[PDB]
Structure 1
Amino acid sequence: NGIFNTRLSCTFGYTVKATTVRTPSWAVDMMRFNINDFVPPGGGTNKISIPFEYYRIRKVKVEFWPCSPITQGDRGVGSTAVILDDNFVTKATALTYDPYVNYSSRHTIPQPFSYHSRYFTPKPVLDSTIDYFQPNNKRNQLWLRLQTSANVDHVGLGIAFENSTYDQDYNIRVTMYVQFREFNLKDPPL
């Protein structure tokens, strides 16, 4: 019974910029997800620090910690709509509109200091030409070989940012519940 669950994480900061355009404008960005970011390489015979052959990421929880004070004026609001097919809205600095407003997966994020999170399930990128993927199924969730460095990106999220005359800074944590299989330890002697 070599099945194993754990919860895995990373965090990084991001800056939304101060702007000069008086009409409301939007900053589009995107979010791809590779586990090679999340892993340290192991040493010796075990190339990867985590002894497993297999993995499948059950959930992805993406957190949003602002550096933005509550005292900050020029307050805004954004949208948070999940992308799962690598077909992205083009990353733009000041879009005239919000392309994320009429997706089914849009959640609303206020700006600048408002806390946000999305608690969801990832999808990797199997073939870029086809972009084919499962329904929501834990039971027939397929397995992925734990590799050295050639691990697949998971297309997770497209994001929007209504632009402001101040900088908006966000400590963006990404947390993953990842399921595992086939513990594969190597023990050379001495």
Structure 2
Amino acid sequence: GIFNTRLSRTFGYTIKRTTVKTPSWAVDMMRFNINDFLPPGGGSNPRSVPFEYYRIRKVKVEFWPCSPITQGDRGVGSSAVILDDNFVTKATALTYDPYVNYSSRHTITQPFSYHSRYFTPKPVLDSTIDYFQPNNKRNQLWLRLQTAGNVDHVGLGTAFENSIYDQEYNIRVTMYVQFREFNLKDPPL
């Protein structure tokens, strides 16, 4: 019983100002979990979408700027796809862009420019070995939609060039999911 749908979530991210003169970059990570998109249900149905299995097909991360088009001290960054839960260490002012030479690098124009990334994440099945599957719609694993313990999906790391002014963003993540085995429970009343 397949049901392809779309789930979204919005949150903020700010790159604080720095008095440093050099071009330094701010590094951060981004994971994706389905608990943040799918709330708990009620009653005999533990989740709000009554299905048993799921598998995330795609994610769309949108960096919607919060800064005016008149803001100066512009910069240039990079967003890369990291499917293994080993990101570059979080840094405030690093002397280089680590994600620049990555094959999945897209340039981030800053601060007042929109940046989208559309990709297929991978689940963290074993963080010790960090193995994942290649892209195959027919062979992608089905995970279970747990009650409160779903596994973290992974796949984006960023590097933003710091500035004299604060750079704020409203980040909207949209997960395109595919469920299976409609499992609604209908007790009497």
Above 0.5 in TM-score?
yes
Q: Structure 1 length normalisation: TM-score?
A: 0.98
Shift of 1:18: 1.0
The CA distance in 2 between the partners of 1:95 and 1:104, in whole Å, is: 20
State the Cα deviation string for residues 68-105 of structure 1 (Å, max 9, x = none): 11010111111011110001100000001111111000
Higher strand proportion (structure 1 or 2): 2
The CA distance in 2 between the partners of 1:55 and 1:103, in whole Å, is: 30
Shift of 1:7: 1.0
State the Cα deviation string for residues 118-163 of structure 1 (Å, max 9, x = none): 0111111000111111111001011011101110001110100111
The CA distance in 1 between the partners of 2:176 and 2:47, in whole Å, is: 19
Unaligned 5+ runs, structure 2: none
- Aligned residue pairs: how many? 189
Q: Aligned residues: percent identity?
A: 92
The CA distance in 1 between the partners of 2:166 and 2:47, in whole Å, is: 39
The CA distance in 1 between the partners of 2:112 and 2:18, in whole Å, is: 17
Unaligned 5+ runs, structure 1: none
State the Cα deviation string for residues 29-69 of structure 1 (Å, max 9, x = none): 00011111111111111111110001011110100111011
Shift of 1:28: 0.3
Q: Structure 2 length normalisation: TM-score?
A: 0.98
Shift of 1:185: 0.3
